[PDB]
Design a binder for this molecule. Structure first.
Ligand code: CLA
Ligand code: CLA
Ligand code: CLA
Ligand code: CLA
Ligand code: CLA
Ligand code: CLA
Ligand code: CLA
Ligand code: CLA
Ligand SMILES: CCCCCCCCCCCCCCCC(=O)OC[C@H](COP(=O)(O)OC[C@@H](O)CO)OC(=O)CCCCCCCCCCCCCCC
Ligand SMILES: CC1=C(C/C=C(\C)CCC[C@H](C)CCC[C@H](C)CCCC(C)C)C(=O)c2ccccc2C1=O
Ligand code: SF4
Ligand code: SF4
Ligand code: SF4
Lengths: 160, 171, 739, 41, 61, 80, 130
């Protein structure tokens, strides 16, 4: 399909990889005894390996000639769960972190001892700001509009 | 008693009078060496130094060279002798250039007194200054020293080769 | 109102916990730049600059020692708890030669359960190379319940040491005169601590370890072995194994000590069953050590008209060559903690290295000689600790010279006379270092270039120009002849390394004569050269810590400063700290070469298997003798060859070793950013980053500053050491566990 | 418990607690839903 | 400008260039740099105050 | 020999002069500051370039500046 | 024992002057002390002052000035440093006008003073080929 890849559900090398891993795990399982915790752990390993391979097969995942899932990150929504949705999730979380950090910096920057409140965090104010970051996309595009997001010329510059 | 004292009663020199720097054994041993033995012209000092140095220099080249022989070989001896002679030539070249760039004097132990008495209002470093009063510290003295080193090195290397051949053959 | 302690000196309060940097006069005002944060941790334990009173520094040091001992006890309790709960110690007891010791199981997350290896005995976990199983077996511990109780005792002891530290800083802090009783302290540490510890351990060995281990070696399973207390209440369970307890303590009090030859032997060699030292020999050794140390503890005058005064001993040791001699040394060592730390750390690291040598040389634990990973790990770890401690001793000697050295109090004594001719010492040490390096390494390079030029007869090899270590071979011959000639009451040599028979346990070689040839000559001279260069750097740091021809007032700049400026052609790293930094680098080099020599020589010419007919086959096959004489040989037949197991560990239970190999490479390369660069570039880059932050109104109030020059060097050296030591750690462990 | 709570509000203790909590919920997500290469939806 | 006034630093070779500081005292003598300004941010040397000329400071509204 | 320049931002706090290890700087009368004194560099032939002088300078970007130049046995700090 | 009676009671160190302070220049520091205090040499170790005139020779001006700075801790202030060329060419150096450089003395002219701040320095491109 895309880039010459093929779905992993029809990739023979993918099933060969699964079979080889299961065979190695079973051979390891053979050298232990009865329902002893080592055998239980190896059986859990086998079950998890089978579940992971089955989930990857039924996941709209494209496999190359090596039988490994390749990620299609050109931007198409068909393979949108590989990069685009995790990209949105990370952008949300990281914007949350950056927004709460910036808000805390600007909030304790207007107190008597701004530097003290950076090594000794005001946990009440920190908790107040941190749970308010869920609106960071909206807060950012409400502070940029008001001109409160960017400094203009009070920023310092070197000699040249 | 204390066997370490300031050198020549000067506590500010970067030196000490230890039982090695200023011991009677050290005094006599260094005064019998060719570099400091009294009554030797610079040519004689160079000749003796070259003889000793070639004599002990042929050894390592002949014994451990690229053409060794557990038995006695004339080729091994010739190789060691040639290597020793060429090393002496390199050392003589170094001596010559060092003397060329170091001194500008032809008769020392006088110029110092002349400029300490008759004034030295010149470009200095030749009239004034002048480090050391030995005859080895002149352009003429160092030239003869290098000449003696070179000739004595050749002679001592040849003598040591002859001795090595005699020892390996008749013993 | 005791005469030794002050009651309730410091109030137990949490107020100062909320004021970081309260100890320092400069840091107490609060952070203004990020340099304050780093300065906070760099001055935490520098008690000299926190108080102007030696008494307060001594009390802080005493409580810090208590905290450290509590940490050590907690670590030991954790080790025993892991042995009790997450180990296969019981299975290893019944099959020491076929079960690999494991005492750490790994949770099944993110696929990391592959690290649980097939260590044997129906167990999965990480193979343990600390030798705790062998130590516990030598202690007579035959059950995991005993390990649990030892862990509980360790926890109780750790709490006790924590309470002791709190008590002796906040409730009853000793006075300076108590700390300065060096005669009493030496008497107690020599008699009580050392001698009585040896005596108590000899008692434990004789009454618990001797019978239990004898029964274990006889084939008695641990379940039918009597509980250890039964060997004390019943004089018949121990009198069957050692038929001399039937006479009781009467032979001891009647001076008929020959009767106790049953369990106090002098045999030498190794136990043929376990491959370790005879535990009867060990018990006799500890008894003799106890008596010797108890006797040695009655030397210094403490509270009666009896004993020696260290001041009078030192002041009487003058000489024609040494002026006032040791006059003033007692005042130096009783008023400066840094001098004591220097001496103790140097001798402590040297002792650690000696311990490392004597460990593999004479394996003291049952079934530890045939556990090659344990032997390799123990040697390498102890040598590393020794090198670090020696560098620390040099560092604290330099610190004493900078800070606690008084010129007036040391007029014409040994310290003064050493400083007065420091030039001669350093110049001759420089010449010796150049001579040793030229010779050792250039002989290596000559071998390499002769081999590369196809001239095999021109090498410094055994089949070529040969440099036989005749002096060491003479000593080896003297030791193998000692039993019956110079040690007439010995039955076997102290170690089979000096010569004798091949000792094998379960077809695995425990010890064997270590032959010394031209390959050992070169590597030993490499060791000497590296040690000499490290000594050169550290001694130059100590001697030139106060002044020099460059900076005549270097003592006024302190122990830790980056430079004096770009003048004088450049005055970088003139400190004494910058000498402990370079010396750390050279110690890493020396110890790395030492452990490489040990690993290759043991794998190639000691360790291996013995055929039933007596044929010895080694791990590598004797390639050390002919291929360790060239740098290409070290690169190929050792590094490249034995790195195969590390690089091929992916997908196996040793994959963690490959991951740590790669990560240690990454950290070592990361160090070079700090080691090669300078502070100005990073400060000017932080300037633009701060511009961006200010543009987005997110510049922190604590102004971000690049790490100071000294801190940049410290970070670089710490990362370099961590990366190199971790790379060698992963390489050694993967290689010696795979094969 | 006025200065102890202030000590717990210091940067190292707060960072250690936050990173321990963060690693905790990450590890537990990866335990309950392991081997997640793509978005579950 | 006077004591307590807020000024912007116009000296280019300044750790507080384009930044705002508080005037501590303006000297009335014939000194070259009479204006003394205190800042909240310490410079690279650790100081937080400096003397500025009359043309190197601009009062904030 | 190195070059040392003094700038009128000098406040005459004398910290440069009392930090010079080779007696290069000295305090001379002036009328450009409250202290009535300014640093001078009349003995730059002894300047070693250690830059202790400008490490003790409290003015914003320094009032004493050391420009390294030609080297001399005095400026190289050679006791030999 | 020593060449001169005013030398400090120093046992000599291999850190003193070398052949340079015999053909290029040597520095001598003189001072008078009330007590025979024990002080640390800038070169080596501990020396003992004389209860009176003290004279010490060094290879560098910095060594003499470090010794003088140490002397200030002994409440010694009258120390004076001289430069001696290969012959007896004595030149007073440190108390040049009899007043220490840290104290303002009349009769001193500013040397190396620029009537502008750092920002007034000319651009290097305009200082090319001169
Ligand atoms: C939490 C606040 C915060 C915010 C909003 C930003 C924002 C920014 N940083 Mg930044 N930074 C921060 C903290 C922050 N940083 C910290 C703590 C450090 C020290 C490690 C840095 C080091 C740094 C460098 C070296 C660079 C930036 C750069 C940037 C810019 C591009 C984004 C980027 O590369 O991220 C960079 C982010 C990191 C390197 C990791 C930050 C470390 C953690 C995640 C942040 C700290 C969280 C904090 C403790 C939360 C506490 C708040 C709570 C008490 C309420 C952007 C202006 C770049 C730039 O200038 O581009 C224009 C750049 O080169 N930053
Ligand atoms: C000081 C040395 C030391 C070290 C390095 C360890 C290290 C370890 N212990 Mg441990 N332990 C120690 C002392 C130590 N312990 C002591 C003294 C005791 C007795 C109380 C225990 C009792 C103990 C138990 C009961 C368990 C461990 C477990 C573990 C492992 C997982 C730890 C974890 O995820 O906790 C995370 C901790 C936090 C997030 C708290 C912050 C880890 C290898 C666990 C293990 O191996 O699981 C299989 C486990 O179940 N330990
Ligand atoms: C709850 C008990 C308690 C309380 C409230 C205090 C309270 C105090 N102690 Mg104290 N102390 C205690 C127990 C306690 N101590 C114990 C058990 C010991 C023995 C180790 C000491 C030893 C001690 C010394 C030697 C000193 C103090 C000092 C102080 C004062 C300042 C402490 C500070 O800011 O550092 C708070 C520091 C910490 C919280 C760091 C804890 C460090 C631990 C031990 C490291 C463990 C980490 C572990 C090894 C893992 C590493 C990875 C303060 C009054 C100082 C003082 O009064 O002088 C001004 C001082 O010099 N204490
Ligand atoms: C026979 C008596 C005796 C014994 C056994 C010890 C033992 C010890 N002393 Mg010690 N000491 C003694 C007498 C004694 N001292 C006297 C008389 C003085 C006064 C001059 C000192 C002054 C002194 C200082 C200043 C320091 C020590 C330190 C140490 C420890 C060294 C660390 C070590 O080797 O770890 C081995 C550890 C163990 C074997 C663990 C078990 C040891 C336990 C704690 C028994 C300790 C015995 C104790 C003195 C009994 C007092 C109990 C109390 C209720 C009165 C060690 C525990 C150092 C240390 O670490 O500080 C804590 C230290 O800095 N001692
Ligand atoms: C008994 C051992 C001992 C003791 C008591 C001390 C005590 C002291 N040393 Mg010292 N030192 C030692 C051993 C010791 N050292 C050794 C072995 C070395 C050689 C490396 C040194 C080298 C040394 C130098 C070079 C200096 C000191 C200094 C000091 C003083 C301040 C220490 C401080 O505040 O650090 C606080 C503690 C820290 C900053 C911890 C830093 C963290 C380390 C560097 C990294 C550890 C990594 C660890 C192994 C885990 C890595 C694993 C990774 C995967 C994460 C103090 C008196 C300093 C001083 O000014 O003395 C007056 C100083 O300049 N020491
Ligand atoms: C492979 C890299 C390398 C090498 C070769 C050296 C070599 C040396 N270091 Mg070291 N060093 C290194 C890395 C290295 N270092 C690193 C990374 C650091 C950073 C921490 C240091 C830090 C350091 C310090 C701090 C010190 C040294 C010192 C020394 C010298 C010890 C004396 C000696 O053996 O001289 C003999 C020279 C050699 C063994 C080099 C090879 C010479 C060959 C084998 C023989 C001669 C070849 C011949 C002349 C070639 C002629 C032909 C040619 C003209 C074409 C020596 C020059 C010490 C010193 O100054 O010397 C006493 C010292 O104090 N080093
Ligand atoms: C701080 C983050 C964090 C979070 C959000 C959770 C969340 C959870 N843990 Mg948990 N846990 C954590 C850290 C965390 N854990 C740590 C650090 C440990 C020690 C290593 C554990 C040990 C642990 C155990 C032993 C169990 C949980 C269980 C659980 C679940 C039910 C409660 C829940 C999903 C329980 C569960 O769901 O198992 C069935 C359970 O039995 N946790
Ligand atoms: C920086 C690059 C990077 C990226 C993009 C990833 C991405 C991924 N890694 Mg990975 N990893 C990295 C670096 C990276 N890793 C490094 C440096 C290491 C070495 C330590 C690892 C070691 C590692 C292991 C050992 C494993 C992964 C796994 C995973 C996958 C599962 C992620 C997960 O737990 O989601 C679930 C968790 C979240 C989405 C957290 C956010 C949830 C919040 C609470 C939502 C709340 C708001 C609504 C994912 C594809 C796992 C896997 O299955 O691989 C396919 C796995 O087993 N990684
Ligand atoms: C080894 C030489 C040795 O230790 O002899 C010992 C020799 C004798 O010195 P003293 O008799 O003065 O020592 C008496 C007291 O100081 C006891 O230490 O010491 C020296 O002279 C140091 C010179 C080292 C020269 C290095 C070669
Ligand atoms: C990068 C660099 C800096 C800048 C480095 C800085 C500012 C350090 C920043 C450290 C951050 C802010 C905290 C550490 C973050 C790590 C992720 C934590 C360590 C990892 C743990 C597992 C220990 C210098 O200041 C410097 C100074 C002198 C020589 C070389 C250099 C140099 O190379
Ligand atoms: S900064 Fe680096 S180079 Fe410049 S002086 Fe200090 S150390 Fe020497
Ligand atoms: S460099 Fe700076 S400090 Fe050193 S002398 Fe010249 S001016 Fe005085
Ligand atoms: S340094 Fe700047 S401020 Fe300090 S004295 Fe010299 S000139 Fe005046």
């Amino acid at each position: 399909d895309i880039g010459g890849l093929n779905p992993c559900k029809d990739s023979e090398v993918f099933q060969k990889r699964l079979a080889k891993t299961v065979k190695k795990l079973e051979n390891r399982l053979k050298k232990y005894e009865e329902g002893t915790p080592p055998q239980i752990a190896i059986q859990q390993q086998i079950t998890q390996t089978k579940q992971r391979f089955t989930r990857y097969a039924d996941s709209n995942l494209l496999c190359g000639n090596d039988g490994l899932p390749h990620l299609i990150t050109d931007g198409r929504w068909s393979h949108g769960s590989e990069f685009l949705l995790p990209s949105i999730l990370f952008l949300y979380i990281s914007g949350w972190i950056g927004w709460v950090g910036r808000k805390y910096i600007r909030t304790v920057g207007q107190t008597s001892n701004p530097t003290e409140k950076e090594i000794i965090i005001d946990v009440p104010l920190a908790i107040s700001i941190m749970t308010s970051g869920f609106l960071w996309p909206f807060a950012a595009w409400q502070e940029f509009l008001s001109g409160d997001l960017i400094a203009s010329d009070e920023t310092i510059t070197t000699s040249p | 008693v204390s066997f370490i004292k300031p050198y020549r009663q000067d506590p500010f020199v970067g030196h000490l009078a230890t039982p090695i720097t200023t011991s009677a054994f050290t005094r006599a041993y260094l005064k019998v060496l060719p570099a400091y033995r009294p009554g030797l012209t610079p040519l004689s000092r160079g000749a003796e130094i070259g003889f000793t140095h070639g004599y002990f220099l042929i050894g390592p080249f002949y014994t451990y060279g690229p053409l060794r022989s557990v038995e006695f070989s004339l080729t091994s001896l010739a190789a060691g002798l040639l290597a020793a002679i060429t090393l002496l030539l390199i050392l003589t070249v170094g001596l010559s250039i060092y003397g060329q760039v170091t001194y500008d004097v032809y008769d020392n132990a006088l110029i110092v007194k002349l400029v300490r008495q008759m004034v030295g209002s010149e470009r200095t470093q030749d009239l004034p200054q002048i480090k050391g009063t030995s005859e080895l510290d002149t352009v003429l003295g160092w030239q003869k020293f290098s000449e003696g080193f070179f000739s004595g090195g050749l002679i001592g290397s040849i003598v040591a080769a002859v001795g090595i051949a005699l020892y390996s053959t008749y013993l | 109102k005791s005469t030794i302690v002050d009651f309730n000196p410091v109030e137990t309060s949490f107020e100062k916990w909320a004021k970081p940097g309260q100890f320092s006069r400069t840091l107490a005002k609060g952070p203004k730049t990020t340099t304050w944060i780093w300065n906070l941790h760099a001055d935490a334990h520098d008690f000299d600059i926190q108080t102007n009173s030696l008494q307060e520094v001594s009390r802080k040091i005493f409580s810090a020692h208590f905290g450290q001992l509590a940490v050590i006890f907690l670590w030991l309790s954790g080790m025993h708890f892991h042995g009790a709960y997450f180990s296969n110690y019981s299975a290893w007891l019944t099959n020491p030669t076929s079960t690999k010791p494991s005492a750490q199981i790994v949770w099944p997350i993110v696929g990391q359960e592959v690290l649980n290896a097939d260590v044997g005995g129906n167990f999965q976990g990480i193979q343990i190379t600390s030798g705790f199983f062998q130590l516990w077996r030598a202690e007579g511990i035959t059950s995991e319940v005993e390990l649990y109780w030892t862990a509980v005792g360790g926890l109780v002891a750790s709490f006790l040491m924590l309470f002791a530290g709190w008590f002796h800083y906040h409730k009853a802090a000793p006075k300076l005169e108590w700390f300065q009783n060096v005669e009493s302290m030496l008497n107690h540490h020599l008699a009580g601590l050392l001698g009585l510890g040896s005596l108590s351990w000899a008692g434990h060995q004789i009454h618990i370890a001797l019978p239990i281990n004898k029964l274990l070696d006889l084939g008695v399973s641990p379940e039918e072995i009597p509980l250890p207390y039964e060997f004390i209440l019943n004089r018949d369970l121990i009198a069957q194994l050692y038929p001399s307890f039937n006479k009781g303590l009467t032979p001891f009090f009647t001076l008929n000590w020959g009767e106790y030859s049953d369990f106090l032997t002098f045999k030498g060699g190794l136990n043929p069953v376990t491959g370790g030292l005879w535990l009867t020999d060990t018990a006799h050794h500890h008894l003799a050590i106890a008596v010797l140390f108890i006797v040695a503890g009655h030397m210094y005058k403490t509270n009666w008209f009896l004993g020696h005064s260290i001041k009078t001993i030192l002041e009487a040791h003058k000489g024609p060559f040494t002026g006032e001699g040791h006059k003033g040394l007692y005042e130096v060592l009783t008023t400066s903690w840094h001098a004591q730390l220097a001496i103790n750390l140097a001798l402590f690291g040297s002792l650690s290295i000696i311990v490392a040598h004597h460990m593999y040389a004479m394996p003291p634990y049952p079934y530890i000689a045939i556990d090659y990973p344990t032997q390799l790990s123990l040697f390498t770890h102890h040598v590393w600790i020794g090198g670090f401690c020696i560098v620390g001793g040099a560092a604290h000697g330099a610190i004493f010279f900078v800070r606690d050295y008084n010129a007036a109090n040391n007029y014409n004594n040994l310290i003064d006379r050493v400083i007065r001719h420091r030039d001669a010492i350093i110049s001759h040490l420089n010449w010796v270092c150049i001579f040793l390096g030229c010779h050792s390494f250039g002989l290596y390079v000559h071998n390499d270039t002769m081999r590369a030029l196809g001239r095999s007869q021109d090498l410094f090899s055994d089949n070529a120009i040969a440099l036989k270590p005749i002096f060491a071979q003479f000593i080896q011959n003297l030791h193998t002849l000692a039993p019956g000639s110079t040690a007439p009451n010995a039955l076997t040599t102290v170690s089979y390394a000096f010569g004798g028979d091949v000792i094998s346990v379960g077809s695995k070689i425990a010890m064997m004569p270590i032959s010394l040839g031209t390959a050992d000559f070169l590597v030993h001279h490499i060791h000497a050269f590296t040690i000499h260069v490290t000594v050169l750097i550290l001694l130059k740091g100590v001697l030139y810590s106060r002044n020099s021809r460059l900076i005549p007032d270097k003592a006024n700049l302190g122990f830790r400063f980056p430079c004096d400026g770009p003048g004088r052609g450049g005055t970088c790293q003139v400190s004494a700290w910058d000498h402990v930094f370079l010396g750390l680098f050279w110690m890493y080099n020396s110890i790395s070469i030492v452990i490489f020599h040990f690993s290759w020589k043991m794998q190639s010419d000691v360790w291996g298997t013995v055929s039933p007919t007596g044929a010895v086959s080694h791990i590598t096959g004797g390639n050390f003798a002919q291929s360790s004489i060239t740098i290409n040989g070290w690169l190929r037949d050792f590094l490249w060859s034995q790195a195969a197991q590390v690089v091929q560990s992916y997908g196996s239970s040793l994959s963690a070793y490959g991951l740590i190999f790669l990560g240690a490479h990454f950290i070592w390369a990361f160090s070079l950013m700090f080691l090669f660069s300078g502070r100005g570039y990073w400060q000017e880059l932080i300037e633009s980053i701060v511009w961006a932050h200010n543009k987005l109104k997110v510049a922190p109030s604590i102004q971000p500053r690049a790490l100071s020059i000294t801190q940049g060097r410290a970070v670089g050296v710490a990362h370099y050491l961590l990366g190199g030591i971790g790379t060698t750690w992963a390489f050694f462990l993967a290689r010696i566990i795979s094969v | 418990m006025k200065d102890f709570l202030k000590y717990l509000s210091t940067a190292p203790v707060l960072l250690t607690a936050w990173l321990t909590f963060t690693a905790g919920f990450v590890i537990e997500i990866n335990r309950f839903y392991p081997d997640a290469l793509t978005f579950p939806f | 400008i006077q004591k307590g006034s807020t000024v912007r630093i116009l000296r280019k070779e300044s750790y507080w260039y384009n930044e705002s500081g508080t005037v501590v005292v303006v000297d009335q003598s014939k000194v070259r740099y009479p204006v003394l300004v205190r800042f909240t941010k310490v410079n690279y040397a650790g100081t937080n105050t400096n003397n500025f000329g009359l043309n190197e400071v601009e009062e904030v509204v | 020999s190195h070059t040392v320049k003094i700038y009128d931002t000098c406040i005459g706090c004398t910290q440069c002069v009392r930090a010079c290890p080779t007696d290069v700087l000295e305090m001379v009368p002036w009328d450009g500051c409250k202290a009535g004194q300014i640093a001078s560099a009349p003995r730059t032939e002894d300047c070693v370039g250690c830059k202790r002088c400008e490490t003790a300078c409290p003015t914003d970007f320094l009032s004493v500046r050391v420009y390294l130049g030609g080297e001399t046995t005095r400026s190289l700090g050679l006791a030999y | 024992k020593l060449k001169q009676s005013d030398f400090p009671k120093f046992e000599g160190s291999t850190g003193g002057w070398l052949s340079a302070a015999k053909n290029e220049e040597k520095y001598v520091i003189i001072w008078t002390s009330k007590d025979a205090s024990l002080f640390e040499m800038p070169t080596g170790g501990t020396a003992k002052m004389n209860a009176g005139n003290n004279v010490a020779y060094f290879a560098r001006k910095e060594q003499c000035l470090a010794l003088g700075s140490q002397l200030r801790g002994f409440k010694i202030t009258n120390y004076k440093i001289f430069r001696i060329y290969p012959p007896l060419d004595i030149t007073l150096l440190h108390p040049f006008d009899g007043v220490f450089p840290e104290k303002v003395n009349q009769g001193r002219s500013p040397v190396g003073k620029r009537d502008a701040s750092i920002g007034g320095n000319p651009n290097p491109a305009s200082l090319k080929f001169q």
